Amino acid sequence: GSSGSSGQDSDSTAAVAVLKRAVELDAESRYQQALVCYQEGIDMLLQVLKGTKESSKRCVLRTKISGYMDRAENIKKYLDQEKEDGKSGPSSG
After folding, report:
1. From CA 20, how far away is CA 90, in angstroms rounded?
2. Number of structural domains the chain divides into
């Protein structure tokens, strides 16, 4: 190929991007964003893996998905609590 961000497009691709972006957000402390992103990819990968006979790819994939699921969770689990933690509104929330 050639060093240049122009091409590269596919199904799982979107996941690669979404996933990538997620990481960033995660590093930006924007878990609320890195979460969905992470989920957006996982969901995408899931379908990818589902359609992956490769005994290897599956490993990697399954390793990526899950690897992106744990984080997402930890986040969500932290987001759900961070939500109510808000302790700021008209009444409850």
Report:
1. 37
2. 1
